[PDB]
Amino acid sequence: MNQQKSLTLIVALTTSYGIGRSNSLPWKLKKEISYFKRVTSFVPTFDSFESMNVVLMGRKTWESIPLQFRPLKGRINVVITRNESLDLGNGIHSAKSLDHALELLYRTYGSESSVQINRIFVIGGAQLYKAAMDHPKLDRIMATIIYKDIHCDVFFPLKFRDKEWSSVWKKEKHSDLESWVGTKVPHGKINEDGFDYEFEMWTRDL
Numbered sequence: 001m002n003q004q005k006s007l008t009l010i011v012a013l014t015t016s017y018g019i020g021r022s023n024s025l026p027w028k029l030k031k032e033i034s035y036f037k038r039v040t041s042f043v044p045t046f047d048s049f050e051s052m053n054v055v056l057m058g059r060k061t062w063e064s065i066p067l068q069f070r071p072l073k074g075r076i077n078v079v080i081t082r083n084e085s086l087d088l089g090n091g092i093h094s095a096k097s098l099d100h101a102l103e104l105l106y107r108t109y110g111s112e113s114s115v116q117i118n119r120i121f122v123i124g125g126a127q128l129y130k131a132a133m134d135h136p137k138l139d140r141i142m143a144t145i146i147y148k149d150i151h152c153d154v155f156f157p158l159k160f161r162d163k164e165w166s167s168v169w170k171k172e173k174h175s176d177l178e179s180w181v182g183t184k185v186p187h188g189k190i191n192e193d194g195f196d197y198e199f200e201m202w203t204r205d206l
């Protein structure tokens with residue numbers, strides 16, 4: 001048991017690929033947070049009482065969510081840490097690597113589980129993003145592009161939107177995005193508190 005399912009990466013980044021500053025988000029986008037919640041939470045109604053999505057995150061990203069928004073609700077949370085000394089959590093799983101987390105979910109949630117897994121999402125940070133980028137099951141990127149050069153100190157590891165990667169990663173039609181996400185999403189740019197941003201979906205053939 002290891003991988004059958006595809007992986008989906010979800011990120012909010014500037015046109016310079018900046019993803020963060022001083023172990024937090026250098027922007028306050030309340031509607032950007034609501035899209036995240038929605039995307040990472042959505043499960044088809046037919047499958048809504050048995051299934052759930054999984055959110056995989058690096059230990060620094062875990063330390064970043066307000067104590068108040070931990071764990072992410074209605075989703076299975078898995079923290080990747082080598083230094084799993086003692087991860088505190090009443091059913092928050094810890095796994096030492098990306099593949100180590102996949103076999104743990106595959107083990108902990110099989111046919112004999114009252115809880116089934118729908119979608120698997122990598123939600124950050126930079127180091128976990130580097131590992132997912134290299135994983136042979138990663139085929140989709142949900143990106144939020146922020147059209148401002150906001151000073152950042154952590155960058156997204158692969159320039160997926162750049163010409164060097166244009167035969168690999170392709171941006172999908174907005175109707176393709178809303179269908180995957182199962183709901184309707186804002187087309188065009190969104191301005192909220194001085195930042196212009198937009199929602200995109202990139203995919204690659206495995």
Ligand SMILES: NC(=O)c1ccc[n+]([C@@H]2O[C@H](COP(=O)([O-])OP(=O)(O)OC[C@H]3O[C@@H](n4cnc5c(N)ncnc54)[C@H](OP(=O)(O)O)[C@@H]3O)[C@@H](O)[C@H]2O)c1
Nearest residue numbers: 012020023024058059060061081082083124125126127128
């Ligand atoms: N803009 C966005 O969408 C977005 C999304 C998420 C996060 N962020 C930001 O990204 C920054 C955090 O990024 P980061 O790179 O510093 O942290 P990160 O990936 O969240 O955390 C790194 C820690 O996670 C574990 N880890 C991650 N990848 C691992 C692997 N392949 N194998 C084993 N352990 C692994 C290790 O834990 P131990 O060292 O405990 O082993 C490593 O020190 C923060 O500024 C956060 O705000 C932005």
Ligand SMILES: COc1ccc(OC)c(CN(C)c2ccc3nc(N)nc(N)c3c2)c1
Nearest residue numbers: 010011012024025036064065069123124144
């Ligand atoms: C209540 O939840 C949070 C509140 C504050 C916060 O910041 C410090 C975070 C950090 N965090 C996981 C976050 C936020 C926005 C995101 N947007 C997109 N597109 N992709 C992500 N992987 C993402 C991740 C989470």
